[PDB]
């Protein structure tokens, strides 16, 4: 689509991890998507695998990294 009436636009975020728009509004957009998908089906087993993929997003909304230095962690 490159022509003389067209404009291409390439952007690189400085860091895709650890951006402000990725902590809260990215997890809670996916957890909401698995609430509307828990109503689509009827099994006790397709809901249960979709209540585990929701549980890994609740647990990653707060996280901690374990990096040691010297003798302290």
């Amino acid at each position: 689509f490159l022509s003389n009436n067209s404009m291409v636009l390439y952007t690189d975020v400085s860091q895709w991890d650890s951006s402000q728009h990725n902590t809260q509004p990215f997890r809670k957009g996916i957890i909401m998507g698995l609430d509307m998908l828990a109503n689509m089906t009827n099994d006790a087993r397709v809901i249960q695998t979709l209540n585990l993929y929701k549980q890994t997003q609740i647990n990653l909304m707060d996280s901690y990294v374990q990096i040691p230095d010297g003798n302290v962690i």
Binding site: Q20, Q24, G29, M36, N39, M40, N42, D62, N71, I73
Partner: protein, 794 residues
Amino acid sequence: QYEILQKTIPTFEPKESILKKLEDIKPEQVKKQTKLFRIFEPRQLPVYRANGEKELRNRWYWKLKRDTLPDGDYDVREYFLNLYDQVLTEMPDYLLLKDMAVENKNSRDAGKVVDSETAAICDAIFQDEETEGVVRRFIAEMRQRVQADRNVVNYPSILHPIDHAFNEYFLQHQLVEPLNNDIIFNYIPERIRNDVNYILNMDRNLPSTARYIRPNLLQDRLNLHDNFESLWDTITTSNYILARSVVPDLKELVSTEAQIQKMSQDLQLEALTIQSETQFLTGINSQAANDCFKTLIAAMLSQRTMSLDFVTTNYMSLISGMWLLTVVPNDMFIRESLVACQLAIINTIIYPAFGMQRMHYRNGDPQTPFQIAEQQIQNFQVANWLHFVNNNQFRQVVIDGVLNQVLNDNIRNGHVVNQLMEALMQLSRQQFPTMPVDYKRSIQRGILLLSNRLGQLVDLTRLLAYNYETLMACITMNMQHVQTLTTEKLQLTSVTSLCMLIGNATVIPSPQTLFHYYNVNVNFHSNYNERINDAVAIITAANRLNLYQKKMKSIVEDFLKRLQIFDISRVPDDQMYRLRDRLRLLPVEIRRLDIFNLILMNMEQIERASDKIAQGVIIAYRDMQLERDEMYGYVNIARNLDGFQQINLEELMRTGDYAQITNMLLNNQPVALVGALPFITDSSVISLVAKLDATVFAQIVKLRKVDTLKPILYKINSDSNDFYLVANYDWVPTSTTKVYKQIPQQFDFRASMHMLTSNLTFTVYSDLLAFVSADTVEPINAVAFDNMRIMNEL
């Protein structure tokens, strides 16, 4: 040895709400009241004679319980909408008086009065030494009257006449109807108890006592399929997933886990390997036959529009699509994708068979390419099947008060397959003149895998139109046929797995999953009409109470909330203020209309008989005698607002143009302000002679604000200081301004006793299909609407 480095993550709470399916919506928990609805309470007040001196006896008077009336004439009407929402949640469904009846402490024989408060009143009058004797004798002969043969009682009460008209209405208007064996069987719909295959049985018979609360199952007064194409999409995708749950699995697929072990230990003994008698094709599985049986039935019972998905280069999926369009009516398949499948049968199978030129079908022609190829074709048997597909329509009939769309009579029979396979045989005996011979051999091999299955395809049509016919008896809401927004993808390579993988085993829906599909279409339809009537009764009571300032988005926001299947925050103000113009035009249900008139008739008797709010002050600029009362002594009160020009202080704050009053307050014209003012009490008499009551209005001229108005209500009596001015000097007290305030009523004990009546015992039962225990006849001999059976083919 650790160290914690924690940072501040900004909190982000998105607008959302929980959405439940139709399978788990809790029914409305029934409300029964514990104490009477009391808004007036007797109180002990001192009494003053005509002189002003305090009398030795006291007197009882009706005052409000928790008299919290907001000031200003608009905030009072906002209180009475709030009172109207308080009587509705306290209004009981069934009210027994044996649960709320406490013992009278002293009577002739030890009887019961109807509440703990009205026993606390009648013992307060007995030990009060100042009471008369004939009031005390009336409490002695105050017992209950019980009648066992009609099981009604008559408990006494002591209620205010406004309080009595609210409790008398709760007793005569109850939602309990009697219940017995011959009315449980009327709860089951007519197309199930008049069905041969299901045999209905019950153990216990209910007594002549037991009652049940019938749900208001009248059709949707909102036409939510008319112009609401975003709310009807989510009220049918909530019904399509419920209907998919109750459509049963095919008997060729499903069996228990241990039967695989039970069939593996004897498979080497009894060699039965080609009993299934089918030619295999690549892309044929049984998990798609079980899938296409459920997305053909559950997309009909909820009226989703299916969308066909296929590839043109599969000559068998297009032949199996010929069975699909001739059973399911073409109004359900979506027009952009029915046409591309209805044209692909023409340009591949029908028109090369006769050697005709393949049709130029432009985009968006108003005639579908079966309706344009019954005119262009010259055969008789394939122009008789193309006439049935062009005129296959649902037949909107109303049955048992529920309009539901039955199929054509030939489709329930199976005779449409004998119209198709009579047409699919003449098309196979043609020559295919233009096309080469291997193209003729590629259809004649594939069109004969479907004509060999006539006995198994004349019976799939019977079974598919019997599972749809049986389950349709269990709906309650009115199914309308309107094309929805989002479609349900039915793969045409999954009808081929249905058409040639079924056989000789009726799957009939068991009656334990018909009673569950019916008890969740009642529990949602009765949770619909009890949210319409709860949200019409506030919209009509907002316009009747003259609330011009209330934005009525909020009382439609919670109407869509209590229907548990809608997400509120993705429904804008456009689809919540159009809905207000529909809920306004509806008549409010009779229990809410008869109780709003019991507020509207005496919303001026609750407002006038309370302290800390006075309905406007009048100004005279002349000495006039203030009238003597018995509970106040000497008070500058005015019972009628007559003879004076009125200013409406609801409007003087609304428009805010104070030019009328501040030109009428400097010239000393007699003015009667009208509103709801908080008044203060100035019991001293030497403030009256100093004319304090006139000096409070001059803060309307310098300062524009009128809400900071406190009119003076004098009270001159014996306990007031400096009272000897009234005693020695022969003068009656004269004021300048008097307060338009009403006198509280007297508590006359013998005129306030009311004999409340109710029944003795109920046993209110929640659902009625727990009693009747149904079971199905053996599916080898299971009978359709014809008395011949289905799955009769060998």
